[PDB]
Write a protein that binds this ligand. Structure first.
Ligand SMILES: *[C@@H]1O[C@H](CO)[C@@H](O[C@@H]2O[C@H](CO)[C@@H](O)[C@H](O)[C@H]2NC(C)=O)[C@H](O)[C@H]1NC(C)=O
Ligand SMILES: CCCCC/C=C\C/C=C\CCCCCCCC(=O)O
Lengths: 48, 49
């Protein structure tokens, strides 16, 4: 690749619907809006 | 949101005509677990006739 951008934050796993594409919630609207113009993959993980 | 919840065997249906809604009010009363949508998105449900 020419660049590798990683955006990370803490978020509960019960709220996957608030980050799915097409969501109308306040979290996408005011906190985090994903680019979706470059090949991207959003993963949900638990870190020990 | 303010009545007895219907069963799946006898579910309720309401058809809305000639009225104005406000989807931002309805999304605060619920916590959404999953939405499965065809040919539309909830952000499109927020705006359109
Ligand atoms: C649609 O519903 C939202 C949710 O209630 C309304 O936002 C409220 O507006 C009042 C008036 O300013 C505030 O006191 C509340 O704090 C707001 N609540 C939220 C959650 O933001 C909104 O005004 C409604 N839309 C219209 C056109 O009335
Ligand atoms: C469209 C308003 C009129 C219909 C109201 C009837 C039921 C509304 C109840 C919940 C509305 C949620 C719609 C989008 C669901 C996913 C929200 C999101 O995470 O993006």
């Amino acid at each position: 690749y020419s660049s590798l951008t990683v955006d990370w934050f803490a978020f509960p796993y019960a709220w996957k619907s608030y980050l799915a594409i097409g969501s109308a919630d306040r979290i996408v609207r005011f906190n985090y809006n994903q680019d979706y113009s470059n090949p991207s993959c959003r993963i949900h993980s638990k870190v020990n | 949101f303010r009545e007895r919840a219907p069963t799946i065997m006898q579910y309720k249906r309401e058809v809305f005509t000639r009225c104005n809604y406000n989807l931002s009010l309805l999304l605060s009363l619920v916590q959404v677990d999953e939405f499965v949508c065809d040919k539309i998105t909830p952000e499109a449900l927020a705006t359109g006739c």
